[PDB]
């Protein structure tokens, strides 16, 4: 019975530690999300047409 309670609350710490990591991850990416969107969108909008390097004549 002691072991089951420990496993229970050990699981609670696991769940609590997981929530901390998930919220910290969200907090971090919120500071870069806008910068990444600008960089990624520019690469999509910049078409850069090209002819295959091996095209002859």
């Amino acid at each position: 019975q002691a072991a089951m309670g420990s496993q229970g609350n050990l699981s609670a710490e696991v769940e609590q530690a997981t929530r901390r990591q998930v919220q910290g991850m969200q907090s971090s990416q919120q500071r870069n999300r806008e910068r990444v969107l600008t960089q990624l969108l520019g690469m999509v909008c910049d078409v850069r047409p090209q002819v295959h390097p091996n095209y002859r004549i």
């Binding site: 295959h52 390097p53 091996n54 095209y55 002859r56």
Partner: protein, 600 residues
């Protein structure tokens, strides 16, 4: 000056618009400029053997046509260096790319053009002098062990118009200017020679001098010579790589070219780590081994086509040093991996195979490779004498000496060092079979042995008779149970064991067996044979008397002699020199004679 890639099937690339290309010309395939060599011509399309991985090569990629064939740069800066299968230095790649992987399409000079070499001319040439192919017009001091002779390339000749005074020159400068008929040639220290062409010699001479091997067996019973060719077709675990390393470390050769063609990558690292720590005294001074060795790495997980270039680069390097008056003993630790490359390419080529899938011309390639060995009189007015020996491993599948590569090799090489997997399992190293091995240079060296030793030859003969007699008995003893054996035969059987356990095997990873000077091998053999003759006499003179000296009587009476004889290996030639070893063996002979006098 370009073609275009038409198709790729792996190591073989097909290209079009190459009507003027010749066979065995170099090409640069792809935008990374991968190195390859033309094998076939079909109309205006060429079949290219590519020595670098073709992954990522596209149809339509340019192919640069290079008029020069596969060739190696020969000059100062080779010794101490490690090259890949096509003569690109690995120490220069790692120092320039900062990577741990070898990039594809690397175009790096074989010999550095930054080093300022110390050059001294021969001091015998003048403007107007007539110089011919092979002549030496100066020497470069690469290091304290090998003096690098600067030769006029073969197929070149003329009058001297300028010779660089002694001083510091690099490989991009002009050392010699010569003219023939209006046409003038400017030469540096580096010459180029196609690896598939045999460098010309004045005369091929008979081999009449031992190639010293740091082994008891593989020397006492099956000698190799300077300029000879041998094969070691050992199965996996037989220790043929260790034999090759032992020969490289401790031999009487001047230059070793070690070719790792399909070898495990750890083996080339092993050499680079260990060799710098070895010593070989020159004139009272201790020097490292690497200054007189060079090695080529084309490991098993590298491009398979490069295995052919590696073998030919290796032997071409060996010939170059041969021409300078040095004795070279190169060894390619595979052979089968080269023939394997030929099979894989032949398959991609859709050629008709011969025995066991190998190309019909397998024998042609091996014959022309091995025949480049030999003691020669060199081309060149200075009258040099050199040699190239070839000690080539073979990897027969299953240890069955029946594959086309082992079979063809045995028809070419003159010394056969067969290894037995069942001896290696018993850690009976080196795992030499000693029943199927042979050396065809025994008669050639008989003169040498008589000049320096004399006693060696009759000892060699008696040792072979004892080992062969034991085998003849073992066949029947297995069935009889040692019941019908005469006392004279039991002596043979136990002396043969003495020879097998103490003489034929040695632990190459010990301070005492890592090198076995010849005087020690023949010294301790003399004692073992002397015991045989005295023990056999002891019973032969008493069998008809009123008390027969059976093995059990001599065994108990002389047990200390049998232990002393077995201890003869533990002599440490580096700590205890020749004088102590010879005196020690002399004492064992006296101890035996005194014990026999008390016995008989």
């Amino acid at each position: 000056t370009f073609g275009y890639v038409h198709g790729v099937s792996g190591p073989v690339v097909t290209a079009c618009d190459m009507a003027g290309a010749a066979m065995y010309e170099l090409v640069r395939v792809g935008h990374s400029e991968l190195v390859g060599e033309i094998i076939r011509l079909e109309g205006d399309m060429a079949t290219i053997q590519v020595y670098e991985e073709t992954s990522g090569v596209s149809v339509g990629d340019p192919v640069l046509r290079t008029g020069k064939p596969l060739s190696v740069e020969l000059g100062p800066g080779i010794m101490g260096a490690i090259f890949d299968g096509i003569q690109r230095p690995l120490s220069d790649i790692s120092s320039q790319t900062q990577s741990i992987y070898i990039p594809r399409g690397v175009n790096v000079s074989a010999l550095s053009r930054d080093i300022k070499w110390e050059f001294i001319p021969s001091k015998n040439l003048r403007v107007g002098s007539h110089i011919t192919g092979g002549d030496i017009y100066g020497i470069v001091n690469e290091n304290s062990l090998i003096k690098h002779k600067i030769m006029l390339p073969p197929r070149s000749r003329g009058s001297v118009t300028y010779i660089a005074p002694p001083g510091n020159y690099d490989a991009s400068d002009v050392v010699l200017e010569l003219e023939f008929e209006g046409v003038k040639e400017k030469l540096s220290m580096v010459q180029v020679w196609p690896v598939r062409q045999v460098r010309p010699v004045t005369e091929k001479l008979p081999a009449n001098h031992p190639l010293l091997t740091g082994q008891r067996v593989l020397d006492a019973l099956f000698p190799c010579v300077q300029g000879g060719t041998t094969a070691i077709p050992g199965a996996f675990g037989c220790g043929k790589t260790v034999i090759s390393q032992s020969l490289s470390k401790y031999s009487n050769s001047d230059v070793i070219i070690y070719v790792g063609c399909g070898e495990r990558g750890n083996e080339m690292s092993e050499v680079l780590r260990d060799f710098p720590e070895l010593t070989m005294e020159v004139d009272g001074k201790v020097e490292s081994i690497m200054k007189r060795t060079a090695l080529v790495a084309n490991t098993s997980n590298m491009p398979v086509a490069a295995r052919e270039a590696s073998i030919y680069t290796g032997i071409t390097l060996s010939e170059y040093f041969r021409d300078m008056g040095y004795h070279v003993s190169m060894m390619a630790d595979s052979t089968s991996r080269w023939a394997e490359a030929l099979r894989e390419i032949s398959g991609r080529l859709a050629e008709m195979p011969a025995d066991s899938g190998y190309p019909a011309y397998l024998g042609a390639r091996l014959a022309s490779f091995y025949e480049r060995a030999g003691r020669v009189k060199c081309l060149g007015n200075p009258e040099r004498e050199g040699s190239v020996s070839i000690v080539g491993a073979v990897s027969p599948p299953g240890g069955d000496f029946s594959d086309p590569v082992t079979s063809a090799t045995l028809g070419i090489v003159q010394v056969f060092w067969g290894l037995d997997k069942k001896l290696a399992q018993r850690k009976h190293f080196p795992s030499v079979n000693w029943l199927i091995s042979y050396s065809k240079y025994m008669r050639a060296l008989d003169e040498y042995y008589d000049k320096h030793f004399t006693e060696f030859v009759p000892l060699r003969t008696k040792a072979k008779e004892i080992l062969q007699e034991e085998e003849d008995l073992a066949e029947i003893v297995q069935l009889v149970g040692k019941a019908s054996l005469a006392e004279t035969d039991k002596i043979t059987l136990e002396v043969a064991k003495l020879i097998k356990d103490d003489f034929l095997q040695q632990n190459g990873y010990t301070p005492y067996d890592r090198f076995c000077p010849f005087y020690k091998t023949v010294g301790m053999l003399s004692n073992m044979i002397s015991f045989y003759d005295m023990a056999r006499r002891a019973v032969e003179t008493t069998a008809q008397s009123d008390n027969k000296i059976t093995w059990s009587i001599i065994r108990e009476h002389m047990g200390e002699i049998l232990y002393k004889l077995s201890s003869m290996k533990f002599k440490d030639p580096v700590k205890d020199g020749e004088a102590k070893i010879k005196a020690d063996y002399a004492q064992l002979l006296e101890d035996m004679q005194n014990a026999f006098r008390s016995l008989e």
